[PDB]
Design goal:
Chains A, B: It catalyses: guanosine(37) in tRNA + S-adenosyl-L-methionine = N(1)-methylguanosine(37) in tRNA + S-adenosyl-L-homocysteine + H(+). The structure is a homodimer. Chain A is α/β, with parallel strands linked by helices. Helices cover 37% and strands 17% of the residues of chain A.
């Protein structure tokens, strides 16, 4: 086709609930990426790597406490099988609130990988030593507590999928569509003017203003263009007075 | 049963892909919460609120550009039906990267709501005016770009579900489980000592140290106990020298 070979992204997933990933493999743009063979998601379930009659996948933490942990053997073995399939150059990622905070910059660098293996924890997490022996990088999608690593893993896949060849910075400017007047609220006249240039500048100005007011941190680390600086300056002055 | 009536949580969801929510309603603790009638998730799809032959749910942005937006009428009407079902006291939430940053403190306050309606956007988002007429609060799960609001919505549900009566702060201390020696790596002796007190202190110290090194921001805004301050001080001194 139009896309060169060897540009597809492969993602191995270790999870007790592989079916959860249908949420991204069967719907929307990510689902389309999978259908078009641009994105490949392969899952392995630790429950299939047990040897006891009850397929036990959890274990007690040393030191005591009610906080269960994933059983090491089934989880490690699942990882080993994924690594066997992925072969060379496969970064193993563990999703947890103690990992590096994910942001668009992080998504960009993770997307540079053609192969990734995502480890989804349940219970209170996984053995600290496994982080040392099997995990390459630990990442957190946010500072909040979740019941498992599956949502964080799917969030990561969704974010990086947008960087896959064949698939299709600051806070967005306000957006408007029909009707022209919604419950008495009108669309900014400039957007109805047809003046391509005035519209481009208005949108940029609004984007900068909103980023400044809501996420000023995103501005730090980016040397804005001369135009952006001028528009932002105007917005800041107008906001105050 | 043991749980008093009127303590269950209801969550209405507006999404073009209702099936994605099976990821949380059919698996793990959230799935168990749904099975035990502790959590209720009801979805409405804008596609069911259209009147044209092609069930159109997207529309062109005023001002031009390739960035499509959700069509106002089907989306607004879906919201109205959810509000009709939810009745009184139902906060409507829009998930977007321009919303308030979600953190455990935010999860705690959102969990105080017995009813919530989550609006999941697709395309480039929704009309700015709808945020004014139908949305009560805007929330962001992180500073990264996603293909839709469904994962953010499920992440929010998962986080607040943990606060539901009947269901079951800083970075966790390292955790360990069998075997005692994993690929030559041993479990900290204190955890194998059986000394309940030494273990409690060791774990707290490690939790504080890790929070300090990886997420010092979490410390800001919390007046630690005398013990925590002592252990953290020791950890900081040991880390340096």
């Amino acid at each position: 086709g139009l896309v060169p070979r060897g540009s597809h992204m492969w993602i191995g997933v270790i999870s007790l609930f592989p079916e959860m990933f249908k949420a991204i493999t069967e719907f929307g743009v990510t689902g389309r990426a999978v259908k078009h063979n641009l994105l490949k998601v392969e899952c392995w379930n630790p429950r299939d790597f047990t040897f006891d009659k009850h397929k036990t996948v959890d274990d007690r933490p040393y030191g005591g406490g009610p906080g269960m942990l994933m059983m090491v053997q089934p989880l490690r073995d699942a990882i080993h099988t994924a690594k066997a399939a992925a072969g060379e150059g496969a970064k193993v990622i563990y999703l947890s609130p103690q990992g590096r905070k994910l942001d668009q910059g992080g998504v960009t660098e993770l997307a540079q990988n053609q192969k990734l293996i995502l480890v989804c924890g349940r219970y209170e997490g996984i053995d600290e030593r496994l982080i040392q022996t099997e995990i390459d990088e630990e990442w957190s999608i946010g500072d909040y507590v979740l019941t498992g690593g599956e949502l964080p893993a799917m969030t990561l896949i969704d974010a990086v999928a947008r960087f896959i060849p064949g698939v299709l910075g600051l806070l967005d400017c306000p957006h408007y569509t029909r009707p022209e007047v919604l419950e008495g609220l009108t669309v900014p006249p400039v957007l109805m003017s047809g003046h391509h240039e005035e519209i481009r500048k208005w949108r940029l100005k609004q984007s900068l203003q909103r980023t400044w007011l809501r996420r000023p941190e995103l501005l730090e680390g980016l040397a804005l263009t001369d135009e952006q600086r001028k528009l932002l300056k105007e917005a800041q002055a107008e906001h105050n007075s």
